[model samples]
Target: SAYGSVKAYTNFDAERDALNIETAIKTKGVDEVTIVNILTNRSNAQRQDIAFAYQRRTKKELASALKSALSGHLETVILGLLKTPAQYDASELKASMKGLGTDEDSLIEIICSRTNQELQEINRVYKEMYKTDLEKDIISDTSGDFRKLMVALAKGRRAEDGSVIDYELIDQDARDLYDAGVKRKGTDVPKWISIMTERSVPHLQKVFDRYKSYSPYDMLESIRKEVKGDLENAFLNLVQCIQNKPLYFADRLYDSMKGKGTRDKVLIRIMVSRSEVDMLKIRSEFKRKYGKSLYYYIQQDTKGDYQKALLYLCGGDD
Candidate 1:
């Protein structure tokens, strides 16, 4: 069903929620219980409307108010709640590209997984939010083949005409990938990018399936051997997205909570971004892949109000 975990609260009242949110914000110590209960229960649309109502009712910037009152991850979660889905994603994209170092994994995950519409919205809002072009930032921060893929995707121009998926050409596409395999003899990097990024998912899925008969390994294996560095992650992430987006996010969610403590930034973004998207699918795939629910992992890995808000956004156990 591609259903999200956070559905609209049946009896949602934006004006009332707006008042409560401001109430919590201005409370003596910040009423986190009151804040979390209301915010997490509402869908992104509802939350944004609440922020709107709050802005009108109080004549103050709602996001700025929350930032001043709440601190740390809890504040992040609350701020995230106020954004329209696209703005939040635009923020994530900007954060990934910020500073001297680049977070290639974040770039790869976001750029590779999104649909054409999602990419366009991210591109539109990146400027709306940052006043800078998404493609310009991508090109400046990333180099080589990886940069090419990011630039193309940020343009949101992928071929989507799957009106009729041709079998013969799809099989030929399989051989095309086989020919590009890590030669050190040579690899047609642009061709790889063209086929991977431009072709429809169903078309690519077929090409990958047929690729197995030509090459000794699967699509990911060929990608790993053919490329290295950020390029490999982008290609692999793209294939994963083409294969199963839910499982793709499921894997992403697991990595954040797994080893070396939790990656709170990644954890927060995925939970908040996907909660109203494919969160239930993510939860199901999390259980399928990790053998435990997302809720259980969050419980083990995080604590306090941050954890409580996450648990609520996560909705429930698989």
Candidate 2:
């Protein structure tokens, strides 16, 4: 079966791994290399089971223990590894909504790119963990058309991915989208919102292909002319995922790492989360776009155990 870089370690031993993790925490200097090695090598499901053994052994959650032992970005990655994907994603969204300003990039990437199944799971886990509705929280944290788009995505009602595409509907959408540009200078926001958010990815791809010649001009240009603000990013992210998600994420990684200072939170989040999802393709796209590898960037940007884990977990060289 196809998997991202990290697959389940075939000879997994939850108790052994849990005790090993426990020993690393108890050791002087909080042996981070060992911790990094053990956790990164296993898939999330095994990691989850290891956490159970860790809990039984310590009478406390391994995540909490690791929190006390590890600090900074390294701890963030470790903590994320401990949670289910939904748990990590929801917490990131929650954390993103808090703080001085809304981390709209985090919100947009998470909400726009996750599938219907993951989206629904996030909605469930978000409220369970935070005691507040994800949709309501998104509404309160954001405003304007951006808020509307966020809420619509949080609803987890996207057309399922496996559903068959309808050519007439696809053609109709392409025509509507093309006409919206000429008809009213793109005033038909709702039409776009419906089609972009609700249509299946394959269907959306077909629409984009059909619409391609209609605007030999860039789709991104079309989006920019019509949409504005955070809502614009959300729509663009939806389109990007529909087109090439790994490449979208690769471009995102480039944006995060290119500037003067690293966006540590974004960097850690993408590295830890996408390690299992699409790290291979992300590294591929990174090199194709930047003419350099992710490994090279991480080597240049970060240091110590944090860099080690990112380097190791990145799977392989480009």
Candidate 3:
């Protein structure tokens, strides 16, 4: 389900999109539906082109106009659509780290889950825009083995080698993880960090499979049994992401809505981040795992314009 409903219009007319957006904004009471339909359907590049054309025509920023016209989550999604992917990620990272208390889960998810190339581009953008280092910020805000994992991931050292698969190494790594957690008196955090943060995705997939054969407990169960606190959650998230990213995200969506109050930040982050990537896969996994449509759950859990915006990103139940 790498397929997504949101894609660039093949017969795109930037001027037409620009005018339609303007009309939607300028109309009395605001044409929210029209705006959502247009923005949500276009690719980010197309949206950027539309914004450029809009500014050329009106001598006003399309983002500025949308900001003034729309409010709440609808506004957030539309505005997010107006930037390059790297820029959007940079903004999210900054938002996660800014102010009095940091959003640690957001920080870990962003830094830990991104590839080396994405992280490099994000770090480059962060420095160019904010005149600060993302790594230094992480160090200042976080502590302990968790900080070590974040910094290692932020360094972008994972090799993209697909030339070979060493089953022996995979076996060795699995046994190492077993020794580090289930086989040992206490967990060895660094052993998990080094292997997890440093291995290629293909390599890690093999490692996970081998771990299942080598240990009585599965990877997630062993991690949960041995580790605790944020480190445990981060490692579990890494393993889940390694195993099945769409399912990991589906779980994240469930967690966001499972409790009394919805974690809008988590919902918005996953929706916006994966809209172009693997959201359809996430939707499929969500329904398969939860026995309910993601759309129905979102519709039940959220309200008003925010709910509409999320459902739009969800694309559909299937």
Number of the top-ranking candidate, with lDDT as the measure? 1
For lDDT, candidate 1 versus 2, the one ahead is 1
Global lDDT of each candidate: 0.87, 0.85, 0.85
Candidate 3 lDDT over residue span 213-301, tens digit each: 98999999998899787778788888888888889889999999988988888888788878888888889999999999889889989
State the weakest 10-residue window (summed lDDT) of model 2: 180-189
For TM-score, the strongest prediction is 1
Which lDDT tens digits does candidate 2 get at residues 1-318? 153778899999999999999999999989999999999999999999999999997998999999999988898778888888899999999988996599898999898888888888999999989999999889888988788878887787878766556888888998888777635655677777877778788888888888876775556778887778897888889789889999998888877788887877888888888888888888988899899899888878888898888887787777
lDDT of 2 at 22: 91
Clashing pairs in 1: none
Give the Å shift of residue 109 in candidate 3: 2.0
* TM-score ranking, best first: 1, 2, 3
The clash count of every prediction, one per candidate, is 0, 0, 0
lDDT digits (tens) for residues 261-304 of candidate 1: 99998899889988888999899889988888999999999989
Task: Between candidates 1 and 2, name the one with more favorable TM-score.
Answer: 1
Compared with the true structure, model 3 gives a TM-score of 0.94
